[PDB]
Amino acid sequence: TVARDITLLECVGKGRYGEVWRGSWQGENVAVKIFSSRDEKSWFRETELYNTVMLRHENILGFIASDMTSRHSSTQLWLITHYHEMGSLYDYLQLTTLDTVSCLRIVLSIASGLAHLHIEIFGTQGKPAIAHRDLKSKNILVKKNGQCCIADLGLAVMHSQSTNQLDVGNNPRVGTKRYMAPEVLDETIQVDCFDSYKRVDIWAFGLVLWEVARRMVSNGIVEDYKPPFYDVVPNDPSFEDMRKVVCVDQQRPNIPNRWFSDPTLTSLAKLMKECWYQNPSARLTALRIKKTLTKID
Numbered sequence: 624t625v626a627r628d629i630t631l632l633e634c635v636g637k638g639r640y641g642e643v644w645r646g647s648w649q650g651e652n653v654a655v656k657i658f659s660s661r662d663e664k665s666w667f668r669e670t671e672l673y674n675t676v677m678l679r680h681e682n683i684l685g686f687i688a689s690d691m692t693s694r695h696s697s698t699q700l701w702l703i704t705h706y707h708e709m710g711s712l713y714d715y716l717q718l719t720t721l722d723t724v725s726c727l728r729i730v731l732s733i734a735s736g737l738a739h740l741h742i743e744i745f746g747t748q749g750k751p752a753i754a755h756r757d758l759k760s761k762n763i764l765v766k767k768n769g770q771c772c773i774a775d776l777g778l779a780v781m782h783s784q785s786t787n788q789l790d791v792g793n794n795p796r797v798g799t800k801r802y803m804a805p806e807v808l809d810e811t812i813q814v815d816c817f818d819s820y821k822r823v824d825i826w827a828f829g830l831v832l833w834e835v836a837r838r839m840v841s842n843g844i845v846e847d848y849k850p851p852f853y854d855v856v857p858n859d860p861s862f863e864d865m866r867k868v869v870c871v872d873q874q875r876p877n878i879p880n881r882w883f884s885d886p887t888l889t890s891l892a893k894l895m896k897e898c899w900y901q902n903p904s905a906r907l908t909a910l911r912i913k914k915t916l917t918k919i920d
């Protein structure tokens with residue numbers, strides 16, 4: 624198989640999800656995500672997704688193959704994709720600051736990535752609508768040309784409008800809590816409705832928008848990298864911790880005033896706020912957000 628022709632070179636990530644390695648395969652770098660036992664359904668669902676739906680897009684992490692392998696004293700579950708040496712947005716934002724152009728390129732490209740997933744394309748070159756359900760800075764990769772690509776589709780949801788059936792899988796994993804929409808947290812989400820799942824992505828996206836914006840320099844100031852809600856939740860926040868801050872207190876990420884000196888960060892502040900409506904139906908769509916980012920300077 625592919626697994627046995629891969630040589631594993633360097634561990635570049637370690638978490639509750641398992642591990643990420645840089646390895647080589649046919650002389651090309653690849654990322655090998657080795658899944659924890661707790662997350663094996665994600666590997667299954669993502670293997671399934673990648674093997675049923677044509678997802679390939681500049682801003683979706685490029686899939687190579689999935690495989691099992693008899694490794695250590697276990698059978699490892701590996702998902703093998705293209706490799707982005709910059710790492711995640713999370714990693715990258717912590718090593719550097721952005722300018723107007725690099726900020727816009729990052730956030731637009733993610734918008735385009737989200738929009739492509741969310742839309743249904745009809746016909747044999749088409750696809751079902753897909754909702755990610757766990758978008759965050761750690762599972763968006765940064766390419767050297769400055770564009771991003773979305774990974775980690777283990778919790779994805781698909782829907783098609785001809786069939787009007789909704790595939791949610793059978794996954795014990797629910798999203799990353801720090802990024803969880805109000806309606807998910809207070810359990811008011813309309814689970815029968817596909818638009819609900821898209822709308823949770825937008826919330827999450829708006830939180831990412833904020834992480835990124837903080838690192839864009841204006842007039843030679845910039846904010847330190849911070850995860851959304853850093854000031855009001857501890858590390859690894861509970862589902863209950865978040866409900867209190869997001870739903871009960873209706874708190875939203877603080878916009879620093881320095882952003883209002885700058886016409887880009889002013890326009891993105893408006894944008895991220897229209898991703899954070901308590902009312903899901905008031906949130907902008909991926910496509911609209913894409914159209915807007917395309918017109919900002």
Ligand SMILES: O=C(C1CC1)N1CCN(c2ccnn3cc(-c4ccc(N5CCNCC5)cc4)cc23)CC1
Nearest residue numbers: 635643654656705706707708709710761762774775
């Ligand atoms: O599933 C996830 C999230 C939940 C972790 N993914 C997919 C698996 N990942 C990767 C996919 C595809 N490429 N890729 C490159 C890195 C990577 C590369 C370098 C670094 N570092 C280590 C810290 N010092 C600087 C460079 C970190 C991560 C990580 C990944 C991470 C994002």
